[PDB]
């Protein structure tokens, strides 16, 4: 019937002034564009079919052709930036926004999907979709007493499109649009569907990936406790975005970081810092590094939750990126911590893994480790116990690594190693 048509046949059908022939040709185009391997998007564009599909989007009298053209244009817009641009240049944004209010649920869903692709292209098309007024009808589709009444796929597509409206920086989404979307996003963040939860967490992670004012916009809605609960979830697709969001939040002020701590986040990090998925370990160690850069009371809460031994463990054995994040965490700890907190860090066994990491090739991690060692030595100076620490480093074999780094190509490593050896060895 409409299977395995040539683009020539599709064009002949769509060029006929018979709406039923046009519908069948558009369905053939949809089926061609829905094939697993290499859909002929470029051939369809070159045939000049995008304007015809956009015109069909407005055939209120023929809902099937609306649906077929919406599907075809969705799949064209799923391709390269040039193909999405081809869809946009045909005038598809306002037509899809108009279809958002269609009485046919499948057509409205297809329009949601298409606008999601368009906005997902980048910040320019995102903001253009916003300027055409998509947020109001999109959110109206979700203004129901109980989200569970909506079809699962429909709700998932709406959540994903909203997440794409929150995505990308340079520039970040308009502030008024973020404020308009956030309430519905919190409501979705309390939904029970794993995919909806994952995409809501991804949206929140986008919104928190910026200055402290954006983070404040998010945290003032009260989402941090729910984010921590989701941090404790079993599904990795949920934990990953939740963890990214929590990390973004703790990159902000001390008060926002304290909101993360007050919600019980630290209690989850024994598992996160031992998670078998390397990316979770890296992201959790980076989050810990930003928490240890906080106040001394926040460092103390890190201590009380027994997380210093887990940092020692990650420093001792882990993927090198995770070990680098752990070195950052240790240096921040030693920079902001009290003498008591620093000696506790040493008592947990940080020196040996920290010295073993000086064998790496990355210069910046070497500089970070040397700064942490300098801070620990200052702490030991205020206690007059520098010789015990020097003996601990020498027995470990770290003095050899430092006197070797004296000959490092980088100037900062050279000077820091020489300062350490001149002042304490």
């Amino acid at each position: 019937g409409t299977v395995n048509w040539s683009v020539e046949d599709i064009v002949k059908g769509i060029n006929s002034n018979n709406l039923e022939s046009q519908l069948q040709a558009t369905q053939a185009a949809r089926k061609l564009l829905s094939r697993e391997k290499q859909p002929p998007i470029d051939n369809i564009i070159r045939a000049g079919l995008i304007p015809k599909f956009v015109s069909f989007l407005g055939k209120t009298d023929c809902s099937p052709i609306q649906f077929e053209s919406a599907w075809a244009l969705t799949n064209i817009a799923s391709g390269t930036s040039e193909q999405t641009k081809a869809v946009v240049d045909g005038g598809a944004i306002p037509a899809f926004i108009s279809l958002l209010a269609s009485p046919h649920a499948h057509i409205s869903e297809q329009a949601v999907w298409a606008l999601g692709n368009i906005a997902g292209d980048g910040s320019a098309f995102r903001d253009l979709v916003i300027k055409h007024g998509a947020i109001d009808p999109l959110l109206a589709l979700l203004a129901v007493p109980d989200l569970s009444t909506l079809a699962c796929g429909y709700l998932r597509n709406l959540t994903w499109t909203l997440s794409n409206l929150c995505r990308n920086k340079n520039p970040a989404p308009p502030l008024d649009a973020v404020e308009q979307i956030l309430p519905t996003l919190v409501r979705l963040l309390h939904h029970n569907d794993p995919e909806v939860l994952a995409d809501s967490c991804w949206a929140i992670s986008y919104l928190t990936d910026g200055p402290n004012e954006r983070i404040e916009m998010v945290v003032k809605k009260g989402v941090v406790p729910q984010l921590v609960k989701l941090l404790g979830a079993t599904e990795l697709p949920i934990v990953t975005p939740a963890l990214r969001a929590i990390g973004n939040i703790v990159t902000g002020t001390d008060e926002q970081t304290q909101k993360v701590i007050d919600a019980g986040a630290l209690a989850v990090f024994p598992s996160l810092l031992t998670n078998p998925k390397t990316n979770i370990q890296k992201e959790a160690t980076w989050t810990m590094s930003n928490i240890t850069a906080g106040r001394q009371d926040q460092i103390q809460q890190v201590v009380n939750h027994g997380l210093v031994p887990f940092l020692v463990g990650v420093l001792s054995k882990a993927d090198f990126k995770t070990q680098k994040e752990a070195a950052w965490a240790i240096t921040n700890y030693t920079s902001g911590g009290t003498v008591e907190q620093i000696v506790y860090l040493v008592h947990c066994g940080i020196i040996e893994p920290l010295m073993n990491l000086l064998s790496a090739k990355d210069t910046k991690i070497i500089q970070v480790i040397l700064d942490a060692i300098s801070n620990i030595f200052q702490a030991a100076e205020k206690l007059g116990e520098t010789e015990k620490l020097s003996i601990m480093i020498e027995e470990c074999g770290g003095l050899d690594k430092i006197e070797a780094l004296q000959r490092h190509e980088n100037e900062s490593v050279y000077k820091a190693s020489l300062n350490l050896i001149e002042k304490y060895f």
Binding site: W113, R167, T251, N290
Partner: peptide, 19 residues
């Protein structure tokens, strides 16, 4: 001790094809 923000995402376009 300064806070370190996340590294840039390398996935610059998020789109979905309907099969």
């Amino acid at each position: 001790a300064r806070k370190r923000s996340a590294s840039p995402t390398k996935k610059l376009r998020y789109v979905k094809r309907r099969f």
